[PDB]
mmCIF file of C-alpha atoms and ligand atoms in Angstrom:
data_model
loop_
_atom_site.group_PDB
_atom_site.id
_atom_site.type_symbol
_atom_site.label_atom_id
_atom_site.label_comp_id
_atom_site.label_asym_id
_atom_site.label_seq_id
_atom_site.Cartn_x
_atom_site.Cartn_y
_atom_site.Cartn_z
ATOM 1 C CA UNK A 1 176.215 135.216 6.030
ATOM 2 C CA UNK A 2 176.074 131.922 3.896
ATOM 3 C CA UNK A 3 178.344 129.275 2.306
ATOM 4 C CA UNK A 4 178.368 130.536 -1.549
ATOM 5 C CA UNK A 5 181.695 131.805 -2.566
ATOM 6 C CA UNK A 6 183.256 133.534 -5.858
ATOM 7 C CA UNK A 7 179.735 134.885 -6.799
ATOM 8 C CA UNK A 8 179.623 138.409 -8.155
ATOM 9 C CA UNK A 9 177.113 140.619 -6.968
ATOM 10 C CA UNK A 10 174.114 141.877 -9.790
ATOM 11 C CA UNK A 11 171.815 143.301 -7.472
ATOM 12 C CA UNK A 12 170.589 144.004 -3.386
ATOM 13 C CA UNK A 13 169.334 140.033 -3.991
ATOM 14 C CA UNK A 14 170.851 138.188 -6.983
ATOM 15 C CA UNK A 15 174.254 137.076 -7.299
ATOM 16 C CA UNK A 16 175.955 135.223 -10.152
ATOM 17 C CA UNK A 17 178.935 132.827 -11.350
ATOM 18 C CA UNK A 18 180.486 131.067 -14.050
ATOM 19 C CA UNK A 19 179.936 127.615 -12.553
ATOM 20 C CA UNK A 20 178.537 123.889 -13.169
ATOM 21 C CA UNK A 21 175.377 123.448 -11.269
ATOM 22 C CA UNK A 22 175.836 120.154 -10.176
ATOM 23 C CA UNK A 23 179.548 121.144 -8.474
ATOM 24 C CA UNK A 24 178.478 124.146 -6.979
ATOM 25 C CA UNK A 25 175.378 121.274 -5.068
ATOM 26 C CA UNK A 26 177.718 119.322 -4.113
ATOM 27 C CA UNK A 27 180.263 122.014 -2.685
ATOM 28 C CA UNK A 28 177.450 123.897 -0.698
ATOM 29 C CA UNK A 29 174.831 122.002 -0.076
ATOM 30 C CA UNK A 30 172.124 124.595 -0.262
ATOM 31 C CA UNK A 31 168.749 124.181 1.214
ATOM 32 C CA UNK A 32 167.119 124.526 -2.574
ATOM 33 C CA UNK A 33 168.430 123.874 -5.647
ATOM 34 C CA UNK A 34 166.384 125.050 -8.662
ATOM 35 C CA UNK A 35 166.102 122.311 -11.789
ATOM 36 C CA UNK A 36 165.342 123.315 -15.134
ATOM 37 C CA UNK A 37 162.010 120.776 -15.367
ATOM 38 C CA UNK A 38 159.742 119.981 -17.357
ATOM 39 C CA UNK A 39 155.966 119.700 -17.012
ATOM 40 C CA UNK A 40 156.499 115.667 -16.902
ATOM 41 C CA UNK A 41 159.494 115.802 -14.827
ATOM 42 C CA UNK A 42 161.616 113.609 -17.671
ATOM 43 C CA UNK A 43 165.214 114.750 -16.503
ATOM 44 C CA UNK A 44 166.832 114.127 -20.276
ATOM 45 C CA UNK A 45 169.063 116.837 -20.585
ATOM 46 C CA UNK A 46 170.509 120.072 -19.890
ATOM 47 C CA UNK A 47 170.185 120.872 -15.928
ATOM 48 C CA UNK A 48 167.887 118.265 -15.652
ATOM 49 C CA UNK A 49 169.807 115.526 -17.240
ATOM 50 C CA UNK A 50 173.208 116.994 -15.372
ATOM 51 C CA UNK A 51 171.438 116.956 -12.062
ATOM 52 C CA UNK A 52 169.696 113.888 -11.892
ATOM 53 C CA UNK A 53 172.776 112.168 -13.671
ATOM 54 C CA UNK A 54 174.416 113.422 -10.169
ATOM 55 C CA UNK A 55 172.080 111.766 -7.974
ATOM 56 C CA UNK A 56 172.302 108.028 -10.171
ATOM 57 C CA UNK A 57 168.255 108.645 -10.876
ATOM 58 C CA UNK A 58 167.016 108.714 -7.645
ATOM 59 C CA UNK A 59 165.946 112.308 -8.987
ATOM 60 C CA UNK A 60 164.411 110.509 -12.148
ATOM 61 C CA UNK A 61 162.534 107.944 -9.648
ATOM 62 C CA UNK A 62 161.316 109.843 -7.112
ATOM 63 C CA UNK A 63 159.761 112.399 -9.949
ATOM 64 C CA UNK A 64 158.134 109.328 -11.833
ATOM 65 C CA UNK A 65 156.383 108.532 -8.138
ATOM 66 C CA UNK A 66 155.308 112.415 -8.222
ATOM 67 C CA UNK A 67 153.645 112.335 -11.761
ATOM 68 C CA UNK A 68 152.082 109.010 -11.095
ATOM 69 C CA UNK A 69 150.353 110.837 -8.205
ATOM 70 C CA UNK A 70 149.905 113.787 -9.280
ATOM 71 C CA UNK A 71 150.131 114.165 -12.865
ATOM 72 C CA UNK A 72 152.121 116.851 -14.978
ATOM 73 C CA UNK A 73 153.133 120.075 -13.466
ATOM 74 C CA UNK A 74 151.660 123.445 -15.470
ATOM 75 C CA UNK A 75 154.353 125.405 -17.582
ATOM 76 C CA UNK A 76 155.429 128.423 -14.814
ATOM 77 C CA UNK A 77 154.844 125.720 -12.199
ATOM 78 C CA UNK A 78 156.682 124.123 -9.844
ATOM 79 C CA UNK A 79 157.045 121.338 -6.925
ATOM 80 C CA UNK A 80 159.624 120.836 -3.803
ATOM 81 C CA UNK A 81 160.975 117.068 -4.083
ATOM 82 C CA UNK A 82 164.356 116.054 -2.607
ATOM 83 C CA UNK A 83 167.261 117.249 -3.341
ATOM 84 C CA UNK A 84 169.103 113.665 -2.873
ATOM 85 C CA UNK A 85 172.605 114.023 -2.218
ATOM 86 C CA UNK A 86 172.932 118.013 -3.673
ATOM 87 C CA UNK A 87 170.784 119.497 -1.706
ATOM 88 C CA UNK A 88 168.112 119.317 1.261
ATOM 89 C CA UNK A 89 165.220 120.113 -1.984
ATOM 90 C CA UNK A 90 164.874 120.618 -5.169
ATOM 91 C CA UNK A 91 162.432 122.959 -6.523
ATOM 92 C CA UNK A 92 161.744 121.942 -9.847
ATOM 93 C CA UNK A 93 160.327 124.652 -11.750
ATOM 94 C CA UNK A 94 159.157 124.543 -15.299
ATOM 95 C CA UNK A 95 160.080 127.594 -17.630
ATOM 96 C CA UNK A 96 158.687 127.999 -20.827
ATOM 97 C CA UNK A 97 160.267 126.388 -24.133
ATOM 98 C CA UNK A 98 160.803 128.121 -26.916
ATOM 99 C CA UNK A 99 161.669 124.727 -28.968
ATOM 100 C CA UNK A 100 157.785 123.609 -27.708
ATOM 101 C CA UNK A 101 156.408 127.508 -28.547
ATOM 102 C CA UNK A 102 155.635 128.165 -24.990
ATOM 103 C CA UNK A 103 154.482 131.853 -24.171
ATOM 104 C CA UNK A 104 158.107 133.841 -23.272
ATOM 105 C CA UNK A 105 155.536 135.810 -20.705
ATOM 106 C CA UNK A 106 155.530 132.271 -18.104
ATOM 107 C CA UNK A 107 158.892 133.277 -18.034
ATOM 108 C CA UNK A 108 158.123 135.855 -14.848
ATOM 109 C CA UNK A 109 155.793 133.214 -13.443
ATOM 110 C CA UNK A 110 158.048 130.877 -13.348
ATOM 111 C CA UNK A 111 160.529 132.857 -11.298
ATOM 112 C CA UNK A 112 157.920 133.944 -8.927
ATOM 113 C CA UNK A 113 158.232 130.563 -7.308
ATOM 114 C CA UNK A 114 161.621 131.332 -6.305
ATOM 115 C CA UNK A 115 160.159 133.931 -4.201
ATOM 116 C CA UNK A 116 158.580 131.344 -1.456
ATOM 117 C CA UNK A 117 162.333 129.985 -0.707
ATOM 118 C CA UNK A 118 164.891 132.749 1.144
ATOM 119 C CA UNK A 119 167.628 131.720 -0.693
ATOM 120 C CA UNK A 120 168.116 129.361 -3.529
ATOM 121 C CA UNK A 121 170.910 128.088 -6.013
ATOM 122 C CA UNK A 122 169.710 128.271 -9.213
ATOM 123 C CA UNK A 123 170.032 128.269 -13.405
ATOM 124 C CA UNK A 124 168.661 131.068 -15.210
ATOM 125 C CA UNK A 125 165.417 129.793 -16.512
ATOM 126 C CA UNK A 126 164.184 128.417 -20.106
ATOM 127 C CA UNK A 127 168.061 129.219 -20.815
ATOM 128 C CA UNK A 128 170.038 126.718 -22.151
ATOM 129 C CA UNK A 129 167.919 123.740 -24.439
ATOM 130 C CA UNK A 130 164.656 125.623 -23.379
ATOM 131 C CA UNK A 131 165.571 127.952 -26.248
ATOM 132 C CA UNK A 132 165.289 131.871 -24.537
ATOM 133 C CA UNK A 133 167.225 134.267 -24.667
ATOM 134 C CA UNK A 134 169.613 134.139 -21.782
ATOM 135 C CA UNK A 135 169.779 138.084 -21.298
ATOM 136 C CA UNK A 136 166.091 138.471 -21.288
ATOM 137 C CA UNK A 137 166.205 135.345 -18.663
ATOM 138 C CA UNK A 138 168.622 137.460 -16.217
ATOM 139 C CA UNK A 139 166.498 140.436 -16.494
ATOM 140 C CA UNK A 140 163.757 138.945 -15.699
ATOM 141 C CA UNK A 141 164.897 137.130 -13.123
ATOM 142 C CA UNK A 142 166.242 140.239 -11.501
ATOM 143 C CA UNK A 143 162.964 142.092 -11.889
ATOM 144 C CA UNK A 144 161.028 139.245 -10.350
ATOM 145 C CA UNK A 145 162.779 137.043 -7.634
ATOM 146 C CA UNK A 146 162.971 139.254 -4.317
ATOM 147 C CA UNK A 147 164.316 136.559 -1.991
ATOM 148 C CA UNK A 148 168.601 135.396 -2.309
ATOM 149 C CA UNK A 149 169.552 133.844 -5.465
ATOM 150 C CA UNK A 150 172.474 132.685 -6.850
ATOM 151 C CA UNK A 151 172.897 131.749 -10.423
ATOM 152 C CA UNK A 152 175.185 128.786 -11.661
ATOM 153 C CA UNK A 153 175.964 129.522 -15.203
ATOM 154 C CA UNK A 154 177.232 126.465 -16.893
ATOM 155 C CA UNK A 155 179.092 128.403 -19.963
ATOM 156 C CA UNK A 156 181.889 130.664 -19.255
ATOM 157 C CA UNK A 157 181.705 132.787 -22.575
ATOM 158 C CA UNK A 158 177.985 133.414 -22.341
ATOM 159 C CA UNK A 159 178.786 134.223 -18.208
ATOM 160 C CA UNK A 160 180.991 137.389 -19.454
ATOM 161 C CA UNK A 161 178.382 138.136 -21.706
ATOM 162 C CA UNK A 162 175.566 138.179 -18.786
ATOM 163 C CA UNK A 163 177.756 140.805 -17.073
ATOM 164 C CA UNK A 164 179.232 142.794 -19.265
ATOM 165 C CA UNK A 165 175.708 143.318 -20.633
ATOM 166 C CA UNK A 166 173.986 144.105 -16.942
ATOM 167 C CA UNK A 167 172.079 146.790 -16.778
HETATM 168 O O1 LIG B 1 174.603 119.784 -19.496
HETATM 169 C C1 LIG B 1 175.172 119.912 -18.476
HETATM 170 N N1 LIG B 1 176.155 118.952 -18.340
HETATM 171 O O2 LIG B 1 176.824 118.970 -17.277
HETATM 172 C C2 LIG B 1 174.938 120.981 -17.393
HETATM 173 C C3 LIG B 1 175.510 121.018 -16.130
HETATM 174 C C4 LIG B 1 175.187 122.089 -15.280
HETATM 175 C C5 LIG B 1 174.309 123.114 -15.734
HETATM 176 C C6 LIG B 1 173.778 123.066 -16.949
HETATM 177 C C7 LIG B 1 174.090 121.995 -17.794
HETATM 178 O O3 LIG B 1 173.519 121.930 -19.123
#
């Protein structure tokens, strides 16, 4: 049994509600919460900007101290930081964008990192700003993550959409 509540259920594994990100962090307090990154970590906008507004840019510093170190992550890549006051960590994992003419194909790598955490609270990947198709997002997140998600989705018309469309 965990804390999420309201979800609807897609799948044995992947669950799914109309719901602002940054809320639903602050109401659980899941172990992970997935960002929406980039390969520089630059938390402008989107679930990025939203979450690391929530934390005052402790997000924003803690990921210049990573990229200093470490330099950029690789599109389909992620990294665990802190997850401040929304979560115990963040996994920030970078989907491809479209707007950039990333390869739609990272999109299933990217998701695969969501397999190394049992359960995670999540966006649905390159959505959004990153310029995908949400649909095709869903789908492939179903066909790929194996371990408990549950996806936040920030618009409420595009959420009925998502399910009425489920295959
Ligand atoms: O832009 C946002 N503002 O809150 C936002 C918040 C939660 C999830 C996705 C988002 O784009």
């Amino acid at each position: 049994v965990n804390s999420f509540s309201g979800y609807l259920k897609l799948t044995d594994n992947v669950y799914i509600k109309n719901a602002d990100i940054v809320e639903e962090a602050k109401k659980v307090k899941p172990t992970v919460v997935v960002n929406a990154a980039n390969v520089y970590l630059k938390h402008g906008g989107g679930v990025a900007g939203a979450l690391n507004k929530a934390t005052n840019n402790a997000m924003q510093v803690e990921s210049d101290d990573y990229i200093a170190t470490n330099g950029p992550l690789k599109v389909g890549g992620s990294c665990v930081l802190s997850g401040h006051n929304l979560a115990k960590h963040c996994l920030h994992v970078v989907g491809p964008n479209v707007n950039k003419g990333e390869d739609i194909q990272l999109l299933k790598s990217a998701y695969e990192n969501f397999n190394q955490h049992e359960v995670l609270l999540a966006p649905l990947l390159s959505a959004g700003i990153f310029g995908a198709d949400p649909i095709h997002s869903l789908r492939v997140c179903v066909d790929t993550v194996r371990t408990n998600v549950y996806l936040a989705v920030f618009d409420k018309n595009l959420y009925d959409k998502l399910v009425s469309s489920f295959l």
